[PDB]
C-alpha cells in the first residue's frame, strides 16, 4: 500500500546510514513511519527472526551470505553472487 517512491526513500535512508559507517555483515535498520515521513528507531546488528520472508521475495540466502562475508568473500563475487543493486528486487 505504501507509495512506490515512499518505500524507495526509506530504503535509501537505511542505506545512507550504514554506508556512512561502513557496516559489515547483515543488519536491520528499524524505521517508524507516519503520513509521508520516516523516523529512525534502532539497528539490529545481526539476523532478525523474520529474515526468511525477505529471502523469499528477493531470492537471497541471507544467512548463507553472513558466513561468506565473514569468510572474507565479496558481495558481488563468484561466491555470494549478489545481484547489482538496480537488479535486486522482489
Amino acid at each position: 500500500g505504501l507509495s512506490p517512491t515512499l518505500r524507495q526513500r526509506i530504503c535509501d535512508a537505511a542505506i545512507q546510514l550504514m554506508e556512512n559507517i561502513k557496516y559489515v555483515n547483515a543488519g536491520t535498520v528499524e524505521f517508524l513511519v507516519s503520513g509521508d515521513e520516516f523516523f529512525f528507531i534502532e539497528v539490529n546488528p545481526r539476523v532478525q527472526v523474520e529474515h526468511t520472508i525477505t529471502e523469499m521475495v528477493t531470492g537471497i540466502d541471507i544467512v548463507k551470505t553472513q558466513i561468506l562475508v565473514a569468510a572474507g568473500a565479496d558481495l558481488f563475487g563468484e561466491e555470494i553472487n549478489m545481484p547489482q543493486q538496480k537488479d535486486i528486487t522482489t
Binding site: T52, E55, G59, I60, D61, K64, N81, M82, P83
Partner: protein, 91 residues
C-alpha cells in the same frame, strides 16, 4: 529469480541396472531447509513398496540465486537424506 534444480529419489539400484527395489522402509529421515522443496511419494517410515507403479520416493527441488548455489543445496539434501531397507538411486 535465480536457478532451480529437480530430481527424483527412486528405488532404482544404480548398480543393478535400475531395477526398482520393492519391500518395506524401516527408517526415513529427510532434509528440508530454506530453498528446499520436498514432494514425498512413497517415502516414509511405514511404506511397503509395491512393484506396481513407477517408483518415486521423494521429488526433490532446490532453489538459490546462483546455479552453483542451488547445486550445493541439492547435494546436501541428497546427503542429509536417510532411507533404510531398500537400495535407492540417491548415490
Amino acid at each position: 529469480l535465480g536457478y532451480a534444480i529437480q530430481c527424483r529419489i527412486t528405488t532404482e539400484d544404480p548398480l543393478n541396472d535400475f531395477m526398482p527395489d520393492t519391500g518395506t522402509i524401516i527408517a526415513y529421515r529427510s532434509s528440508g531447509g530454506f530453498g528446499v522443496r520436498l514432494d514425498a511419494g512413497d517415502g516414509f517410515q511405514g511404506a511397503e513398496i509395491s512393484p506396481y507403479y513407477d517408483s518415486l520416493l521423494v521429488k526433490l527441488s532446490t532453489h538459490a540465486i546462483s546455479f552453483k548455489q542451488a547445486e550445493e543445496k541439492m547435494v546436501r539434501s541428497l546427503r542429509e537424506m536417510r532411507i533404510r531397507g531398500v537400495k535407492t538411486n540417491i548415490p
